[PDB]
Design a protein around this ligand. Structure first.
Ligand code: NAI
Ligand code: NAI
Ligand code: CAC
Ligand code: CAC
Ligand code: ZN
Ligand code: ZN
Ligand code: ZN
Ligand code: ZN
Ligand code: ZN
Ligand code: ZN
Lengths: 207, 206
């Protein structure tokens, strides 16, 4: 659990992106109202969210403060487990590196892939991962393996001292309560497309 | 824009995930207290979300959410970009089970044409507009590099695609009758750096 509610926490990266978009179009200031319009959050909720962290808005300053709030002024040592399609897609997303997420190694069970170069890292045998985590002070494990007996792999990361798991698998991983588990569900985005495709009808029906 | 507000709409799939899991777990009813916990939402907010459309019957609320989300219908999708991300999306069979039937995958790379993915073969993207019209495609999933991607999205739009599910970190322009949903994995990752750094943050704030 967290000092600030997850509901607020989950809005923070969206404010951050949107302020990045304004800072990059040289927009100097933004009102509570334009900001609320764009975010679909009430102006007063946005005030409240930001009030957790100190005292319209100067774009560059709010941006910089959100960068700080989000921990993006620090470095995280990451590894990726699973060098398949998803693992390589994530590995090649160099924008995460510019935000402080330093990819230190990538691990697979498939000898076909051992030695493959992605950016500056070589795919290594997952056999050595627990050693690697402790040798390299790894903070985050990104999990992109198939789901079968995945708990076992999770357990190996946890007992090697990982601090957080960014999990793409569609199961419930069990981790101790001190370990951060963030589960990705791309369906949550996809299902808003089906919603919007059918919303007009849906309402025809209800009335 | 939408009849219901986007904030409500974005919580619906998450309600549906949780109810789905209660079902698989053979749980039948669920107090609004014990529901509201997990949602980390207020029973009162859960109430007001559903209100746009003492406890809850699990299978009932679930079926209602399936219908609200349009998940009782079937959508034909294509994938543009047969690289790492497009293949990860192609092979994720849960979407299929939810009504998202993959009809075609497209690429520019002559070395991929005919490559078999699940039950689909990779085709030249030069044929994508004919495909769309021939096959009544609803949703195009963009998994290509960023340069001149706007052109590709235009092709999909001119050809009558209804929706685009965009993974590219750029702002596409589409007309007001096309749905555009942008994915940002950073919105999930940056909550991991927030949580790891939170104690430090609040020590430094005080
Ligand atoms: N969260 C979501 O919304 C989505 C989740 N996914 C999931 O992401 C995961 C990865 O997907 P893809 O890359 O398409 O699969 P893939 O088959 O391309 O890659 C999996 C890789 O993991 C390796 N692997 C298997 N067991 C391993 C182990 N114990 N340790 C290290 N490596 C191991 C395999 O050798 C393979 O290289 C799957 O679980 C998939 O279901 C995929 C798409 C969307
Ligand atoms: N939204 C997010 O959070 C994330 C976004 N991405 C993005 O998704 C995209 C795909 O990434 P990867 O699959 O790793 O890249 P990739 O380079 O592995 O694959 C791209 C594929 O697209 C093909 N291609 C290029 N232009 C095309 C066009 N006009 N039509 C059809 N095919 C075309 C190429 O031949 C190649 O097969 C990239 O833009 C990447 O930055 C990746 C990870 C996370
Ligand atoms: C990403 As979750 C904790 O709502 O399964
Ligand atoms: C997901 As968006 C329309 O705020 O870039
Ligand atoms: Zn071993
Ligand atoms: Zn889940
Ligand atoms: Zn669960
Ligand atoms: Zn964006
Ligand atoms: Zn934007
Ligand atoms: Zn049109």
């Amino acid at each position: 659990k967290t000092i600030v509610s997850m509901a607020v926490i989950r809005r923070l990266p969206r404010y951050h992106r949107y302020l990045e978009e304004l800072l990059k179009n040289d927009v100097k200031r933004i009102s509570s109202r334009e900001l609320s319009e764009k975010m679909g959050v009430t102006a007063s909720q946005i005030r409240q969210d930001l009030n957790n962290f100190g005292g319209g808005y100067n774009v560059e300053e709010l941006y910089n403060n959100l960068t700080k709030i989000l921990g993006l002024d620090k470095t995280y040592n990451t590894i990726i487990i699973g060098a398949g399609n998803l693992g390589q897609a994530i590995a090649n997303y160099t924008s995460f590196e510019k935000s402080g997420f330093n990819l230190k190694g990538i691990f697979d069970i498939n000898p076909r892939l051992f030695g493959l170069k992605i950016r500056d890292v070589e795919v290594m045998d997952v056999e050595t991962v627990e050693d690697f985590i402790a040798r390299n002070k790894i903070d985050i494990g990104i999990l992109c393996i198939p789901k079968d007996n995945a708990q076992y792999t999770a357990d190996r990361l946890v007992r090697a001292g990982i601090k957080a798991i960014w999990n793409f698998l569609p199961i419930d991983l069990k981790v101790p309560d001190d370990v951060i588990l963030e589960n990705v569900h791309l369906s949550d985005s996809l299902f808003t497309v089906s919603y919007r495709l059918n919303e007009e009808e849906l309402f025809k029906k209800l009335k």
